[PDB]
């Protein structure tokens, strides 16, 4: 009960909490404290080869219960300690007694009435450590605290052969070489299947056009359902005249032949939900500084992973698949990349089997059979997105309270991060109270649906950032979270955020991988880098040409009229007489589409402007999404609807409006948007953000001027280089680089003099 001076205050790395300021009727502080003692040899808890992690983690918690003490003492308004609150050790623990209207029975000098019995699950809460504390905005003397297993603090002090990196260091006995891990060999035309390519348009409709040319025509693509029980009648997007290399066996993503001791979670999402001692907990409690009965508990809630994972969007059951489907799946697998939008080859932190499922196989859809008409149907999934131990504690921390409810926005991830492993906050939990605080409820939702209302009007920074989405939640935003607080009247969020993947929107020609090793390694999970890299000489004409169309100039002797290398100077001129042969005739239908005999080309900005998940002026608009970031690559802060965050229902209901197409005939005429069904409610959650910000309130090259103005912390020198013949040049801005000249000779040779 009374104060013990042997426990000293500390800051947790994952949320940076250490104290709460109490406000209103009796001010003061609560703060975290721990025992001062050194020589914490956790490696003495020996791990055998013949058993799983759970009995080891329970032995580490039992060891830490002996080796350390933790508590949450109260202080007065000047910082004098009042009472100790070591939750593992305090005398006569009880819940608070209630009147028939749910109110706690109280009188300030006596304190609260105690029932004389502890809350539910007391036999497994007593081992947990408290890590964040908050106060009710509307109810007097009422507080909330968040608790975790002590391994969520000690994770980096556990022994290194179980708390591994996602990549091995190796013994380097043959000397080191970074090319030995990379799957690298490029695909080739099939020696026994050359003829299944797209057909050339034998006659093309006039459409009241007039001009003509000698060049080869556009290529037809057709899809239709037929009458057969398990096959289409046509499916030209599912053609496969390319195949992988043989180099002492076939080159492919095949985890069991690469990962000899595959990296895996400390616990799976279905373990943490059922092993009630390993899940995080929130409790309500009551406190008064000068009473006889100064402190007692309210109610206990589990921050259950299933209350987050069962609220993932329907597509997160099949993270190896996306709404473009068969052609995009094949083009990614041919380039040895991650298929879908979230697979574990890049993102193992959210999967219960970690690296052991780092493959493109069995994506929840029928693919790779002997006939293009037989591929392209929905089936059972091989691996859904989960919430395993490492991602779970990155989704814990950063609390706030609003009305009769309290929240958890997740941490920065420094609970569970490793040098090749990037767990993050992927959303928000809420805990809600009912029957005048007699009862409670718990839920959570991902940022992917909560950010769905973002549009270009909602920021004073730059426009068109890779933050857009559509009717399928295949864009997956996640954050290292700085916190949530009241800025005067406004509720505000801050941190760092994942964009969509900007490094792989431009795409390679199929054969050239052996001269582009970094650009494939950056897609392979071997290089975990999100920065954009200059590589234009090896890109194809468009990111979205289907794999059946590519093999139209294997010699390069026609400069590939339908598909060739991205050089900007040798683009086909549409002029105005040219269009009738190359586009101004090839009309599409409800079963027929075309690939044009036109040499498209352009540099990195034109690639992103066409195929990035850019923001726009209206929500759910972004039909193109590439892939999701390794790590946070944006600043982020936002203003929230605190009312709507209080008003939204506990359970999100999705429906068939968020499902991928069941077969490819529904993919050919695929609906871009739909109204919510009568039973569903997902569209209500889109609007929790009012406004957001990302950097300086500057436009165009002016922003590159700010990038040049700030000092580099390693030497105190600005990247602009101007504060001291043969002087050096700046890096970000173009001012004083090279020479001035007039743009009057460029492109159209017009408007430049005045506009």
């Amino acid at each position: 009960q009374a104060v013990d001076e042997t426990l000293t205050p500390w800051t947790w790395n994952n949320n940076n909490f250490s104290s709460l300021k109490i406000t209103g009727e009796n001010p003061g502080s609560f703060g975290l404290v721990r025992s001062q003692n050194d020589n914490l040899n956790i490696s003495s808890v020996t791990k055998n080869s013949s058993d799983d992690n759970l009995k080891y983690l329970n032995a580490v918690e039992k060891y830490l219960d002996g080796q350390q003490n933790f508590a949450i003492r109260r202080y007065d308004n000047n910082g004098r300690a009042l009472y100790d609150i070591n939750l593992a050790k305090m005398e006569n623990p009880s819940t608070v007694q209630r009147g028939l209207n749910g109110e706690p029975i109280f009188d300030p000098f006596k304190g609260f009435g105690l029932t004389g019995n502890a809350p539910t699950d007391w036999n497994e809460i007593k081992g947990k450590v408290p890590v964040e504390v908050v106060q009710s905005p509307h109810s007097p003397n009422l507080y909330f605290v968040l608790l975790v297993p002590k391994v969520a603090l000690e994770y980096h002090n556990l022994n290194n052969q179980v708390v591994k990196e996602s990549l091995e260091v190796k013994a380097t006995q043959s000397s080191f070489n970074p090319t030995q891990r990379l799957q690298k060999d490029s695909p080739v035309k099939d020696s026994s299947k050359q003829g299944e390519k797209l057909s050339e348009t034998t006659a093309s409709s006039m459409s009241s056009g007039m001009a003509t040319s000698t060049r080869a025509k556009a290529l037809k693509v057709e899809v239709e359902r037929g009458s057969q029980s398990d096959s289409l009648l046509k499916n030209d997007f599912a053609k496969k005249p390319l195949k992988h290399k043989n180099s002492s066996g076939e080159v492919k993503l095949e985890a069991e032949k690469e990962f000899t001791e595959a990296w895996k979670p400390l616990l799976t999402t279905d373990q943490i939900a059922r092993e009630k001692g390993m899940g995080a907990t929130v409790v309500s409690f009551y406190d008064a500084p000068y009473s006889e009965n100064h402190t007692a508990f309210g109610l206990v809630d589990h921050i259950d992973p299933k209350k987050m994972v069962e609220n993932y969007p329907p597509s997160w059951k099949t993270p190896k698949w996306n709404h473009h489907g068969i052609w995009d799946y094949n083009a990614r697998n041919l380039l040895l990349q991650t298929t879908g939008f979230f697979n574990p080859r890049r993102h193992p932190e959210w999967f219960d089997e970690g690296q052991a499922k780092a493959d493109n196989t069995s994506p929840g859809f029928k693919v790779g059979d002997t006939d293009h008409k037989k591929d392209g149907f929905k089936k059972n999934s091989s691996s859904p997105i989960a919430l395993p131990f490492e991602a779970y504690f990155a989704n814990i921390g950063n609390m706030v309270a609003i009305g009769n409810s309290v929240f958890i926005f997740g941490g920065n991830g420094h609970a569970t991060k490793m040098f090749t492993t990037n767990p993050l906050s992927i959303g928000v939990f809420r805990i809600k109270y009912t029957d005048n605080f007699s009862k409670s409820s718990v839920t959570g939702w991902p940022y992917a649906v909560l950010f769905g209302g973002l549009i270009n009007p909602q920021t004073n920074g730059l426009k068109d950032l890779p933050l857009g989405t559509n009717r399928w939640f295949e864009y997956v935003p996640r954050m290292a979270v700085s916190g949530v607080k009241w800025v005067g009247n406004q509720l505000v969020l801050a941190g760092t955020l994942t964009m969509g993947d900007t490094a792989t929107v431009p795409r390679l020609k199929y054969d050239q991988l052996e001269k582009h090793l970094n650009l494939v390694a950056q897609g392979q999970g071997l290089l975990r880098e999100d920065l954009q890299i200059f590589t234009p000489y090896g890109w194809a004409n468009r990111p979205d040409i289907p794999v059946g169309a590519w093999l139209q100039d294997e010699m390069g002797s026609k400069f590939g009229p339908h598909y060739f290398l991205n050089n900007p100077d040798i683009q086909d001129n549409v002029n105005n007489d040219t269009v009738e042969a190359l586009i101004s005739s090839y009309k599409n239908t409800d079963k027929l589409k075309h690939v044009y005999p036109y040499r498209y080309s352009g540099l990195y900005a034109w690639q992103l402007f066409n195929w990035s998940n850019k923001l726009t002026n209206t929500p759910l608009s972004a039909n193109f999404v590439n892939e999701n970031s390794y790590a946070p690559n944006s600043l982020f802060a936002a203003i929230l609807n605190e009312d709507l965050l209080t008003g939204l229902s506990d359970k999100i209901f999705y429906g068939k409006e968020n499902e991928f197409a069941e077969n490819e005939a529904d993919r050919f005429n695929q609906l871009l948007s739909l109204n919510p069904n009568p039973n569903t409610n997902w569209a209500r959650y889109l609007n929790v953000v009012q406004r957001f910000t990302t950097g300086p309130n500057l436009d165009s090259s002016t922003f590159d001027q700010f990038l040049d103005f700030l000092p580099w912390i390693g030497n105190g020198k600005p990247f602009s280089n101007s504060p001291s013949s043969s002087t050096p040049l700046p890096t970000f801005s173009n001012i004083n680089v090279g020479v001035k000249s007039m743009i009057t000779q460029h492109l159209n040779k017009e408007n430049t003099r005045w506009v």
Partner: protein, 337 residues
């Protein structure tokens, strides 16, 4: 965070060196003597300028020339790789959100404190951001640097503040123990691959895109660069890797953001246009202010030392307590009972 990578052909090792002088021509960007890569470079920026700002060649960052860099040659086929900046910070190194008044708020992000002062009420001619940088070389050149940050808080004199302790750092998961650890798994390490590239044209060098070649055996020609992938080997060649860094041996204590007024971040003479392009008039407006950044809201955080360990803070609406010490008799209230 200071962790943009740079592209390299050449290390500080014997006969592998690249020079600040007689090997780079800033006045002649039309030819290979300007050393622009044309392949494998980070988008939007320029590599040789970034190498100069890092000081990988010349006496800019160290008491003698480290001789690390990139060169374009017309005599032979050549090899390169990306390498790190020498810094180990990362974008997950974000600390406490703190609110200063009814409209202004900020947070710690690695070696910086950042403030979003105008987000609730924007204005014309204001850039909307302020930034304060840490100075301590013992923190900035550490191997796991964010572990030295002890928390950030609002203080009752009207400023945000933070705590640091140079005694809090620890070694990597192993000390190499018995073998030459070239791939030291660490927060700025990556498995960067060889890029192999054809000879540059001696004149009219950039009239066409630069052409890469089969890199699948290229690693044998570039073993010095493969050793330079680990940040500790970059720091060693920059003279930062050991006690040659100097400064305070201990020196934990308190850090504070720069002073501010209603004029701070007003750049209205660098904003808008009437003669030229807006970045160029902002560049003119910045050039006379390179030695006076604090009125732009850009600068270094002030710092004071403390005795003993820093473990954390606890906070009240009147006072902040360090390790739980700093309380007072409340002398203005003694006579009331």
């Amino acid at each position: 965070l200071g962790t943009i990578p740079v592209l390299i052909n050449k290390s500080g090792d014997s006969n592998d060196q690249f020079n600040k002088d007689s090997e780079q021509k800033w006045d002649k960007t039309e030819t290979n003597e300007g050393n622009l890569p044309g392949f494998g470079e980070v988008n939007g920026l320029y590599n040789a300028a970034l190498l100069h700002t890092y000081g990988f060649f010349g006496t800019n960052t160290n008491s003698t020339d480290p001789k690390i860099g990139f060169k374009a040659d017309s005599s032979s086929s050549s090899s390169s790789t990306l390498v790190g900046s020498g810094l180990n910070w990362t974008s997950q190194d974000v600390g406490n959100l703190v609110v200063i008044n009814d409209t202004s708020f900020g947070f710690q992000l690695g070696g910086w404190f950042i403030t979003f002062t105008d987000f609730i009420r924007p204005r014309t001619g204001y850039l909307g951001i302020t930034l304060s940088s840490l100075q301590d070389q013992t923190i900035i050149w550490a191997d796991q640097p964010w572990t030295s940050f002890k928390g950030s808080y609002l203080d009752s004199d009207g400023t945000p503040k933070s705590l640091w302790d140079p005694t809090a750092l620890k070694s990597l998961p192993n000390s190499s123990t018995t073998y030459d650890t070239n791939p030291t798994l660490s927060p700025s390490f990556q498995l960067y691959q060889p890029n192999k590239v054809k000879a540059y044209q001696t004149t009219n060098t950039y009239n066409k895109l630069i052409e890469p070649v089969d890199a699948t055996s290229a690693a044998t020609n570039m073993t010095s660069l493969l050793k330079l992938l680990t940040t500790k080997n970059i720091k060693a060649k920059l003279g930062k890797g050991t006690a040659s860094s100097q400064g305070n041996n201990n020196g934990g204590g308190v850090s504070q953001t720069i002073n501010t007024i209603t004029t701070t971040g007003n750049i209205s003479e660098g904003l808008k246009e009437e003669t030229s392009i807006q970045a160029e008039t902002l560049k003119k407006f910045f050039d006379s202010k390179q030695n006076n950044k604090s009125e732009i809201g850009i600068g270094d955080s002030t710092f004071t030392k403390m005795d003993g360990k820093l473990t954390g803070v606890v906070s009240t609406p009147l006072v902040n307590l360090i390790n739980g010490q700093g309380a007072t008799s409340d002398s203005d209230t003694e006579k009331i009972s």
